[PDB]
Amino acid sequence: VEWTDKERSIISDIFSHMDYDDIGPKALSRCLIVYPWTQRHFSGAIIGNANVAAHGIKVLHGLDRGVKNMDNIAATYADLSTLHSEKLHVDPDNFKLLSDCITIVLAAKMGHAFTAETQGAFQKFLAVVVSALGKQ
Amino acid sequence: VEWTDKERSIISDIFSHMDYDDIGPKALSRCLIVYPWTQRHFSGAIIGNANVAAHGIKVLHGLDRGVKNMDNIAATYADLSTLHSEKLHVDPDNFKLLSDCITIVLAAKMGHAFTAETQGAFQKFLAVVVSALGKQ
Amino acid sequence: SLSDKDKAAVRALWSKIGKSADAIGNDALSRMIVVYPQTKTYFSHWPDVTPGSPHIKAHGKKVMGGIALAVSKIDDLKTGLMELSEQHAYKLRVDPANFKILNHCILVVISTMFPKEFTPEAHVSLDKFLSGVALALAERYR
Amino acid sequence: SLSDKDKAAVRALWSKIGKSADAIGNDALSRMIVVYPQTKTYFSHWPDVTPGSPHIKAHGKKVMGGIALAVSKIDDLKTGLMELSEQHAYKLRVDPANFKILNHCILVVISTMFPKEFTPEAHVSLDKFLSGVALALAERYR
Ligand code: HEM
Ligand code: HEM
Ligand code: HEM
Ligand code: HEM
Numbered sequence: 001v002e003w004t005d006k007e008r009s010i011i012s013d014i015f016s017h018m019d020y021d022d023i024g025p026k027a028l029s030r031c032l033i034v035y036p037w038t039q040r041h042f043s044g045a046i047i048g049n050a051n052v053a054a055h056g057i058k059v060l061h062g063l064d065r066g067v068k069n070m071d072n073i074a075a076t077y078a079d080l081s082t083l084h085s086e087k088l089h090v091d092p093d094n095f096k097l098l099s100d101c102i103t104i105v106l107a108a109k110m111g112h113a114f115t116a117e118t119q120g121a122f123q124k125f126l127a128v129v130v131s132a133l134g135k136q
Numbered sequence: 137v138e139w140t141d142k143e144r145s146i147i148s149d150i151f152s153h154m155d156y157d158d159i160g161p162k163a164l165s166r167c168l169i170v171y172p173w174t175q176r177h178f179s180g181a182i183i184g185n186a187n188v189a190a191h192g193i194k195v196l197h198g199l200d201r202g203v204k205n206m207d208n209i210a211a212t213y214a215d216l217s218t219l220h221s222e223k224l225h226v227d228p229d230n231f232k233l234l235s236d237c238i239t240i241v242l243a244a245k246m247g248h249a250f251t252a253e254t255q256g257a258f259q260k261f262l263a264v265v266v267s268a269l270g271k272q
Numbered sequence: 273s274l275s276d277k278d279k280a281a282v283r284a285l286w287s288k289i290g291k292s293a294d295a296i297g298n299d300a301l302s303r304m305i306v307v308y309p310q311t312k313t314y315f316s317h318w319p320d321v322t323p324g325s326p327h328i329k330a331h332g333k334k335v336m337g338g339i340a341l342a343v344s345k346i347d348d349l350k351t352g353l354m355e356l357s358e359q360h361a362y363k364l365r366v367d368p369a370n371f372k373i374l375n376h377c378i379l380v381v382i383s384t385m386f387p388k389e390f391t392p393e394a395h396v397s398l399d400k401f402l403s404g405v406a407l408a409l410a411e412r413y414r
Numbered sequence: 415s416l417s418d419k420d421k422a423a424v425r426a427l428w429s430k431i432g433k434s435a436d437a438i439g440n441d442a443l444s445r446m447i448v449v450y451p452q453t454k455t456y457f458s459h460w461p462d463v464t465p466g467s468p469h470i471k472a473h474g475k476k477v478m479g480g481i482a483l484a485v486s487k488i489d490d491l492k493t494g495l496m497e498l499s500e501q502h503a504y505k506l507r508v509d510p511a512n513f514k515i516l517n518h519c520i521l522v523v524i525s526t527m528f529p530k531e532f533t534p535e536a537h538v539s540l541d542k543f544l545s546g547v548a549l550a551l552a553e554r555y556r
Contacts, residue, residue: 029534030534030537033534033535033537033538034414034534034537034538034541035414036413036414037361037365037367037368037413040365047534085310089313091310091367091369091370092310093367093369094367094369100518103522104521104522104525104532104537105525107522107525107526108525108526108529108532109529111526111527111529112526114522114526116444116445116448116449116465117448119445119448119449119522120448120449123449165392166392166395169392169393169395169396170392170395170396170399170556171556172555172556173503173507173509173510173555173556176507183392221452225455227452227509227511227512228452229509229511230509236376239380240379240380240383240395241383243380243383243384244383244384244387244390245387247384247387248384250380250384252302252303252306252307252323253306255303255306255307255380256306256307259307273492273553350415396556400556411415414538414542
């Protein structure tokens with residue numbers, strides 16, 4: 001993918017002011033409430049469950065890993081891809097759904113700072129990261 | 137993207153036994169009928185219209201192009217890509233639709249020779265080709 | 273939603289195609305599993321889950337039995353498939369994203385078998401009919 | 415389809431949100447245009463197709479007016495939105511795939527302005543509602 005310096009700045013800015021313990025859990029809770037069928041991947045109220053909060057955090061950290069390697073993104077996730085694919089049995093579609101939830105939770109955090117230009121950069125980044133994850 | 141020799145073999149074999157003047161118009165005819173809204177790019181009957189027949193053929197000739205450059209697809213269509221978006225204003229969702237129509241028409245001509253393995257390889261091809269088109 | 277002509281097209285087609293329902297379900301199920309591996313997991317409890325398999329073959333029969341059902345209840349799919357929906361959602365817990373995939377494979381197979389009857393017109397109506405079926409199946413997920 | 419809990423959920427939210435309908439329509443429409451350039455075509459006849467623009471600000475009022483209409487006709491979206499479906503499919507010939515997009519942008523905007531209001535529970539019902547609107551709007555395409 002092609003990145004502009006502006007996009008590098010924006011994504012870096014967002015992830016350096018993000019609070020993982022807050023955004024992480026909220027973004028996963030929302031996905032499990034809005035798209036109930038994803039729940040089958042946590043077979044053991046949803047907003048208070050510590051195991052959910054835990055993977056929510058892991059997800060954001062997994063993304064942070066991509067923010068540092070914006071140029072070598074496919075390789076960076078190859079392993080995590082197999083994890084979700086071959087072993088956890090995740091439907092590739094579920095990644096795109098979580099993607100939207102993360103965007104919505106972030107927008108409610110940054111409020112008026114989540115300008116259209118910021119949305120553009122953040123979504124393009126999640127896109128590349130979702131393809132990589134649903135490719136192996 | 138990764139290609140196995142077996143795949144390279146089917147995709148190549150598929151395109152050499154295919155009569156373009158036949159598959160081209162039928163695939164486009166069908167798409168224009170099954171998904172009516174794509175008809176607004178040929179406003180300047182459907183099954184008999186020569187302008188539609190002609191573009192259907194051009195489509196197959198453009199796919200043939202990417203068959204000759206399997207390890208260089210995104211680059212091979214960068215020109216066609218900008219034409220359909222910049223000038224033609226074709227919604228990228230429309231490539232997804234035409235993709236399925238070609239599969240269905242091809243499936244009717246090859247009959248039972250159109251195995252699940254043949255299908256898988258041919259769909260993977262169009263998937264990659266559609267990505268390079270709706271990307272720019 | 274399905275129109276009067278859409279409904280008559282589907283019935284007309286089903287009247288010709290119906291006799292090969294079992295064969296259609298087997299082939300369609302094989303293609304889905306193969307062409308889209310991600311769907312194999314739902315059938316892992318079966319010993320042999322390959323094209324030839326007797327479990328796929330048995331299940332291809334129930335699937336088409338479900339299509340035959342929808343065809344009968346075509347005037348109200350939502351209440352007609354309330355059961356299958358409740359089942360795939362809470363019991364099998366199948367991801368709703370896969371219904372379009374199976375629909376696509378069924379279309380391919382029908383082209384494969386009845387190229388002469390599966391005209392573009394038939395295709396329009398059968399497609400809307402299957403979108404309706406997928407929509408009704410997704411009914412009890414949220 | 416929307417349940418009584420969904421219908422109640424949307425009315426409750428809308429009563430807190432409705433006052434800012436015009437703000438929401440403008441912001442949402444601006445975002446769509448910037449984030450999904452592909453949708454710039456349909457508004458190409460306007461002189462100023464940018465965030466500030468008086469045409470965008472004007473049209474946003476109408477789009478939200480359509481949503482307000484959908485809220486009233488919630489019990490029957492298909493017939494309540496028939497005319498608008500007619501208009502987008504034949505007069506404007508707007509590709510139907512874009513309704514998903516605008517719906518996404520509106521959800522983001524509502525999230526941006528009413529973060530305390532837009533709970534996961536409201537979200538599920540509003541998403542079901544917006545999908546139904548998208549579905550009603552595609553009614554007359556094929
Ligand atoms: C935005 C994309 C995602 C990222 C970056 C991500 C990242 C991660 C990471 C870093 C782990 C821990 C690895 C380990 O223990 O070796 C993990 C585990 C897991 N992920 Fe994800 N994930 C993502 C999406 C999803 C989705 C959509 C689902 C389906 C709801 C899912 C389900 C799981 C499951 C079931 C586990 C094991 C649970 C556990 O933590 O014990 N993940 N993920
Ligand atoms: C499967 C992908 C497609 C391929 C490979 C393809 C290829 C082509 C080519 C080679 C041209 C000729 C332009 C020239 O002379 O420079 C063209 C033109 C055009 N295409 Fe496509 N196309 C595809 C999909 C589509 C779709 C989905 C639409 C919308 C239904 C569309 C609409 C048009 C229009 C309106 C023109 C200009 C008229 C013409 O010269 O026939 N194309 N396309
Ligand atoms: C055209 C849409 C579909 C129809 C009409 C349909 C119909 C059925 C029927 C009739 C049953 C039989 C169970 C019983 O009588 O109690 C069933 C079972 C099942 N279905 Fe579906 N189905 C559809 C799509 C799917 C999809 C897309 C998947 C998974 C990717 C799926 C997965 C299953 C599984 C795993 C079972 C249980 C198999 C077994 O252990 O017997 N179905 N379905
Ligand atoms: C949330 C779903 C939508 C609603 C409720 C909606 C509503 C409306 C309404 C009420 C009009 C009124 C014009 C008049 O007074 O007759 C209109 C016009 C229009 N809409 Fe939509 N619309 C929606 C989605 C879309 C989408 C996705 C697009 C394409 C990106 C679109 C493109 C247009 C265009 C091009 C016009 C004509 C504008 C002009 O020239 O004045 N609409 N819409």
